[PDB]
Amino acid sequence: FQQGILATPVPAHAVHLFFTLQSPEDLPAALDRLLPQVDGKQLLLGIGAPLAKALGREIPGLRPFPLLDAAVENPSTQHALWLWLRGDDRGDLFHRAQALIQALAPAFVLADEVDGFRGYEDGTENPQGDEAVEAAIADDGSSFAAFQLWKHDLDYFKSLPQAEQDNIIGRRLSDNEELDDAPESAHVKRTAQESFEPEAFMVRRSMSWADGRGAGLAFVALGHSFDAFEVQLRRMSGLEDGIIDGLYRFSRPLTGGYYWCPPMSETGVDLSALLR
């Protein structure tokens, strides 16, 4: 598998690029320039349902980000291709991004970009070691990543008394202690990975972001399938018991996408499932 999915420590910066396929005839030259550069460590690759649909190929486990008909909003903004750049120098990532964007034209056009950088403790409780591989990597070495750009209203959240803030997350801000008497709407009670009848463990690799769209969390959930993320999101959205996650009171996702992260061979990224 692409080692960057689980490899730690996470670099301080990331650039997420999302592309729309606008000229399918030019796709081979774009892939010829892109794929030798995908090492699964500083450059990771994800494939969206539209690209598989455009090639008449059905990738097992790959589907668009779903449509949840709920009382909260989880938009589906599925794109064809996802590039995940990782590094410690922000300026170097931007120049690498620009070269990759131009390398993918005219086949692809840039549809979205998120610049991630590394007040609760998001991303703990992630599976570790062999359990992280089991949770995030399918048998063939593929992974299935859900991406949501969440926008926060910290003015409203920090205006609440600390007791209500902790009731929304489900843990104390002072020492990150779990609250057993927290309401069922508390976030960690909605996403309790052990609380789903088929356990819903996933590996989260989120980053902070801030641009003209606001500020918040670039949420990334990697699993051996999309099922873990989707059952969790459906419960958060009130589709299981009518109880909505408290997160939606001060935060909302602006984007939503499903991407198949192909396996690595010993010599590079393996797209044989998609290409002949």
Contact range with Cl ion by CB under 5 A, out of 6-14, 135-143, 152-160, 194-202: 152-160
Rounded distance between C-alpha atoms, residue 219 and residue 187, angstroms: 14
Here the tokens at position 111 are 């549809």
What DSSP line would sit under 215-246, residue for residue?
EEEEEEEEESSSHHHHHHHHHHBTTTTSPBPG
* Closer residue to a second copy (CB): 253 or 263: 253
**Closer to a second copy at the Cβ: 27 or 135?**
27
Smaller CB separation from ligand HEM, 65 or 229: 229
Residue among 38 and 78 whose Cβ is closer to ligand HEM: 78
- Residue 272 makes contact with ligand HEM by CB under 6 A: no
Chosen residue from 15, 21, 27, 47 binding Cl ion by CB under 5 A: 27
CA–CA separation, 17 vs 259, rounded Å? 12
Asked if 132 is part of the footprint of ligand HEM (rule: CB under 6 A), the reply reads no
Binding of ligand HEM by 169 (CB under 6 A): yes
Classify residue 242 as left (phi > 0), alpha (psi -120 to 50) or beta: left
Q: State how far the Cα of 262 lies from the Cα of 127, in Å rounded to an integer.
A: 21
Is 168 one of the binding residues for ligand HEM (CB under 6 A)? no
Ramachandran class of 264: left when φ > 0, alpha when ψ lies in -120 to 50, beta otherwise: beta
Residue 167 touching ligand HEM (CB under 6 A): no
Segment interacting with ligand HEM, rule: CB under 6 A, options 7-15, 44-52, 60-68, 190-198: 190-198
- The answer to whether residue 145 forms part of the interface with ligand HEM (CB under 6 A) is no
Q: Is 183 in the site for Cl ion (CB under 5 A)?
A: yes
Residue type at position 143: S
Q: Is there binding between residue 233 and ligand HEM (CB under 6 A)? A: yes
3-class secondary-structure state, position 259:
strand
Q: Residues with Cβ < 8 Å from 195, sequence gap 6 or more? A: 189
Residues that bind ligand HEM (CB under 6 A): 120-125, 148, 150, 152, 169, 171, 187-188, 191-193, 216-217, 219, 221, 229, 232-233, 247, 251
